Design a protein around this ligand. Sequence first.
Ligand SMILES: COC(c1ccccc1)(c1ccccc1)[C@H](Oc1nc(C)cc(-c2ccc(C)c(N)c2)n1)C(=O)O
Length: 148
Amino acid sequence: KPITGTINDLNQQVWTLQGQNLVAVPRSDSVTPVTVAVITCKYPEALEQGRGDPIYLGIQNPEMCLYCEKVGEQPTLQLKEQKIMDLYGQPEPVKPFLFYRAKTGRTSTLESVAFPDWFIASSKRDQPIILTSELGKSYNTAFELNIN
Ligand SMILES: COC(c1ccccc1)(c1ccccc1)[C@H](Oc1nc(C)cc(-c2ccc(C)c(N)c2)n1)C(=O)O
């Protein structure tokens, strides 16, 4: 079964679904935060080493998984109608859906396995969760998983 919880960034902005995209908002908004599901992939040895544990990352209600797809010259973060359990239950590592989770204390960064120069990031209030190649400024790449 997967690990579940909410995700916030260092500005205390929680992931929430707004239409067809994930956005990051303060908990003051009183919107239901997405319940994120995370599960470690059974096949780490086949990928890059020393970059953190490769995980599948999805949401419950609606049951969707995050993946990385090249849209022209840009890797983009997308949601696909997919049950995280189906991916974990697949016999091979499904690379577009995988992210290296690199832990530093209470927070972790999420690096695309398909696009290693890009990381999952949030930015300003109510802005979408995207893939970024730009670190340490306007983009927030350190996230906390709150299992409750
Ligand atoms: C809550 O603490 C945990 C934990 C405790 C109890 C139950 C479940 C998890 C833990 C576990 C062992 C030592 C220290 C801490 C947590 O484990 C964990 N495991 C996986 C596979 C992924 C993620 C994860 C994904 C995405 C993001 C963004 C962040 N931040 C973390 N987290 C962790 O390391 O934070």
